[PDB]
């Protein structure tokens, strides 16, 4: 904990230097931070081990950084590692040695796995363990006894209090191993789901499933892959391995439709088995081997309609061998987490790309679903060509003097509209779309503010999507945008920031955002991150633009929301000005137009 | 540069400097490409030649080289038109030159120079010497204001730190030579020795100062014979720069850590690596301290780890660009003192005053539409006198 003169954590009295440090690329500080070198000959082997034990903090193209936490270590033991194996290899990789504090810390968080297990059978939850002593210790805990239903020893626990039981179990250093033995579970009938030979999983896809199915039993946890990596295929493959009834929980009506399409494309399951449970319609959820729905539908708290209530009754009174939870990072929400207890599932598989939140509830996924089974490196996949290369940029748009006059004076939360509706920002967006459209690029424009979304959509006369738009109408636009050459640019809102599959969307633009939402930014960039047909690894196939207003609060949020992407190696080139704007017939070229716009913005309030 | 320094000298000192043959050879060597040949031509000639002949000896192509070399040597006063014979002393002295009349050292120079840099920064463990302390303070790169308390670093001192060791040493020597005359040390003696080194009481004091800087080393309890180091005649990088404003300095010396800490925040310390983050607060502080962005990029650029060398640009453009924006951010408001003139009732005369202000060079900004202009207070009286004259 010694601090140098330059506010630096001095760790020279803590650890020594290994003589053969040149070959060893790893540093291990007593704080737990691990600095791995990406240019070392042995990077590949170290990265796989390190990512499992420690969640990456920042992974630039040259030197990566990882942090050690109890939850991160708990994932290592689950996949198959052991304290002796981890510390031994860690010492082998360390070019300075493992400090005594960290060495004991690793051991401390490895003697807790396997002590207690959670088993669901016959619509009943039991706390299973082969050691009575640990069970007895749990019973001493007050809340553990409170949630109890009102050799190997098992005591039944009420379903409604599973969350509290799991949370306290971690707090008691006795994580519950919610591991599903699908291969030895004949009670639930095996579904006809099968992986067609035409579907081949990429090495990262297979590796992620290997951790899930390291042993005969199936592991429940969170698998993180970059947007567009193909998490749909991995989720479908997980159902194929389980061969049991599968429930898929998307984010919206678009997610389930894409989930339905992916299953048909990447699996032999017949269309009749596939079903949807959404407000728009339902494909007979009562009879279906695979169920696709959304957190809103299942997590709806108020009384359900008769059509939805009947499906909900069936869903509650069912046993699921695999519950795929798309967009896991939304699970820790107050109500969306309840969906886990509402539905009875043996193994909960979580698919997501941005395992970050502005709150501290992201850690709850460790016990709500399970440990982070896998986390692919964005740059590794980007170089491999699995995801299109993106040249992230931040277009700096100077604020209009008339607007800034009001923005500085106004502070009653009306600034967001003022600097979101910047005529200078509008011109850059207008010019960029024209230039990129001429290059046969499929543009996507995002805007958190619907007002701004509407203002720009009509002015540029381009399709726009947000809340009130019906599922069919928004689905129609995507199909047109996907295939119709005429619809080269589309406008989207917070609705389509996640789960929108647009493989050909080369260019992306953002004119508004909800604060410093790293999740929003990374998810928003994900839309164009899908692999392109004629993609080349080092040609910057896709592009991302985050228009910002200079000398404005937007600048702070732009930096805040760029934290995650830069942690993954993405560099946000700053574009102070755009060439060719002057010679372009762009809107708001006169003060009268800008003056008129300012009054409208003020009127909106 | 060395040639630049010689040009800024009087003819009297120059001829005095043209003493023993080694000096003439040293001054000859810096003749770029052309003037060297001219020197050999009119070396055995005792009769001046027309200036026209010199002009026509260089083809029309590359003519600019003919004039620039002639201008350079005219500044050096090697010859005179004499109406272009060389200096008789130079011709004779040069003729004397032209057939007439280790590993420990580099480490010592590097270490001895480093301790001076250690003293430059607030390093408690640094060489202490009253003569050295006043030398740096009088060199224009340091200021004490209190002999009892250790001196601080001036705005230029911080910039001097980031400069590369060759340029860092040369600038110090250039300042030392200029201050040598002021303190009473003859410039010719020290300057002539430097030329002789490349191959009296004043020299003894000068030699001691050179020993202090580590350029020269007697090794025999200050004997007559001295062994100049590599730096006296006139390295792999260790910093990895990340796109996320992170510097991993593979440094074992405390000075380099001190240098990097000037414009970045140090996070962790390891024997062969130090984690530093280039935060805008640190950079803005470094710029405020006196540093210039280009130096920061150059300082990181020169000390670039080999792994980054293959990449082009070696420094990621975003990091370089972001640093510049941080510098340009501070100077958004360009404050400039001036005197504003308004109520220009005489619209016709306003242009005449505008022309008069432009002629004097005092006008800074003007607005014809509003009929107003701003003039620096230095020239305010002149324009005020002009207005009063009417």
């Amino acid at each position: 904990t010694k601090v140098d003169e330059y506010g630096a954590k001095d760790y020279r009295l803590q650890m020594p230097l290994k003589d053969d440090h040149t070959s060893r690329p790893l540093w291990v500080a007593p704080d737990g931070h691990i600095f791995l070198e990406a240019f070392s000959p042995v990077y590949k082997y170290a990265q796989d081990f390190l990512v499992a034990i420690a969640e990456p903090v920042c992974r630039p193209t040259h030197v990566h950084e990882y942090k050690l936490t109890a939850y991160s270590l708990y994932a290592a033991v689950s996949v198959g590692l052991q304290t002796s194996d981890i510390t031994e290899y860690l010492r082998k990789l360390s070019k300075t040695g493992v400090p005594d504090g960290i060495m004991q810390f690793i051991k401390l968080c490895t003697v807790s796995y396997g002590k207690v297990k959670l088993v669901l059978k016959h619509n009943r939850y039991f706390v299973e363990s082969c050691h009575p002593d640990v069970i007895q210790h749990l019973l001493q805990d007050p809340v553990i006894r409170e949630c109890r239903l009102r050799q190997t020893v098992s005591f039944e626990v009420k379903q409604e209090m599973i969350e509290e039981l799991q949370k306290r179990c971690i707090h008691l250093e006795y994580p519950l191993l919610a591991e599903y033995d699908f291969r030895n579970d004949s009670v639930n009938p095996d579904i006809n789901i099968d992986l067609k030979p035409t579907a081949v999983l990429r090495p990262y896809q297979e590796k992620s499933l290997r951790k899930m199915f390291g042993n005969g039993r199936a592991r429940s946890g969170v698998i993180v892959l970059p947007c567009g990596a193909g998490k749909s295929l991995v989720g479908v493959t997980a159902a194929c391995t389980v061969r049991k009834r599968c429930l898929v929980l998307g984010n919206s009506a678009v997610s389930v439709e894409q989930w339905k399409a992916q299953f048909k494309m990447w699996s032999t399951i017949d269309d009749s088995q596939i079903c949807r449970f959404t407000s728009d319609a339902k494909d007979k959820p009562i009879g279906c081997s695979v169920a696709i729905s959304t957190y809103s539908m299942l997590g709806h708290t108020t009384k359900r309609s008769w059509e939805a209530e009947r499906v909900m009754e069936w869903l509650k009174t069912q046993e699921w061998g695999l519950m795929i939870l798309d967009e896991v990072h939304t699970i820790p929400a107050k109500m969306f987490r309840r969906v886990l207890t509402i539905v009875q599932a043996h193994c909960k598989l979580g698919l997501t790309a941005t395992l970050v939140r502005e709150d501290d509830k992201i850690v709850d996924l460790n016990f709500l679903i399970g440990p982070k089974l896998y986390e692919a490196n964005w740059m590794e996949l980007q170089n491999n060509g699995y995801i299109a290369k993106v040249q992230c940029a931040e277009v700096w748009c100077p604020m209009s003097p008339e607007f800034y006059r009001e923005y500085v004076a106004i502070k009653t939360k009306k600034r967001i509209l003022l600097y979101t509706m910047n005529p200078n920002k509008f011109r850059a967006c207008q010019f960029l779309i024209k230039f990129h459209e001429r290059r046969n690029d499929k543009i996507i424009v995002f805007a958190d503010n619907v007002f701004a979304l509407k203002e720009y959509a009509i002015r540029l006369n381009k399709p726009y999507i947000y809340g009130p738009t019906s599922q069919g109408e928004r689905m129609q636009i995507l199909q047109n945008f996907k295939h119709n050459p005429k619809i080269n640019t589309i406008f989207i809102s917070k609705v389509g920031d996640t789960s929108f599959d647009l493989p050909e969307a080369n260019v992306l633009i953002q004119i508004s955002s909800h604060g410093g939402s790293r999740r929003q930014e990374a998810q928003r960039l994900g839309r164009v991150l899908r692999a392109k047909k004629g993609m080349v690894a080092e040609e910057y196939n896709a592009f991302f633009y985050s228009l910002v207003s200079q000398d404005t609060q937007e600048m702070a949020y732009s930096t805040k929301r760029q934290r995650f992407l830069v942690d993954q190696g993405y560099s946000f080139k700053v574009i102070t000005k755009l060439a060719g704007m002057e010679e372009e017939d762009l809107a708001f070229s006169t003060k009268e137009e800008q003056q008129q716009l300012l009054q409208k913005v003020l009127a909106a309030t | 540069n060395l040639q630049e320094f010689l040009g800024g000298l009087s003819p009297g000192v120059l001829d005095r400097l043209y003493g023993h043959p080694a000096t003439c050879l040293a001054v000859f060597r810096e003749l770029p490409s052309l003037a060297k040949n001219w020197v050999m031509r009119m070396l055995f000639l005792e009769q001046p030649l027309p200036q026209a002949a010199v002009a026509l000896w260089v083809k029309k192509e590359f003519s600019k080289a003919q004039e620039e070399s002639t201008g350079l040597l005219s500044g050096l006063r090697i010859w005179h038109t004499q109406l272009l014979i060389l200096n008789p002393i130079f011709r004779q002295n040069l003729r004397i030159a032209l057939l007439g009349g280790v590993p420990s050292l580099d480490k010592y120079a590097e270490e001895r120079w480093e301790v001076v840099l250690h003293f430059m920064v607030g390093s408690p463990s640094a060489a202490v010497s009253q003569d050295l302390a006043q030398l740096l303070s009088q060199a224009g790169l340091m200021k004490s204001t209190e002999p009892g308390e250790p001196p601080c670093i001036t705005s230029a001192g911080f910039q001097f730190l980031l400069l590369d060791t060759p340029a860092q040493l040369w600038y110090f020597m250039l300042q030392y030579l200029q201050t040598a005359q002021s303190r009473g040390m003859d410039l010719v003696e020290i300057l002539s020795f430097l030329f002789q080194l490349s191959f009296s009481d004043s020299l003894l004091n000068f030699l001691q100062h050179l020993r202090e800087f580590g350029l020269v080393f007697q090794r025999k309890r200050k004997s007559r014979r001295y062994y100049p180091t590599r730096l006296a005649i006139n390295q792999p990088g260790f910093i990895v720069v990340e796109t996320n404003y992170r510097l991993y300095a593979y440094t074992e010396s405390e000075l380099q850590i001190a240098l990097i800490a000037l414009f970045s925040e140090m996070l962790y310390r390891f024997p062969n690596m130090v984690v530093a983050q280039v935060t805008r607060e640190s950079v803005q502080q470094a710029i405020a301290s006196g540093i210039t962005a280009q130096q920061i990029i150059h300082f990181l650029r020169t000390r670039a780890h080999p792994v980054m060398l293959k990449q082009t640009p070696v420094l990621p453009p975003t990091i370089t660009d972001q640093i510049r924006l941080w510098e340009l951010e501070r100077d958004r408001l360009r404050f400039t003192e001036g005197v504003l003139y308004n109520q220009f009732l005489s619209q016709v005369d306003f242009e005449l005053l505008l022309a008069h202000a432009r002629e004097l060079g005092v006008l800074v900004f003007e607005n014809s539409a509003k009929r107003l202009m701003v003039v620096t207070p230095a020239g305010h009286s002149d324009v005020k006198r002009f207005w009063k004259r009417q």
Partner: peptide, 15 residues
């Protein structure tokens, strides 16, 4: 063959 724009290709900073 659809090269990148000037602003993306090269730095736009005055310095």
């Amino acid at each position: 063959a659809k090269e990148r724009p000037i602003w993306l290709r090269e730095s736009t900073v005055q310095g």
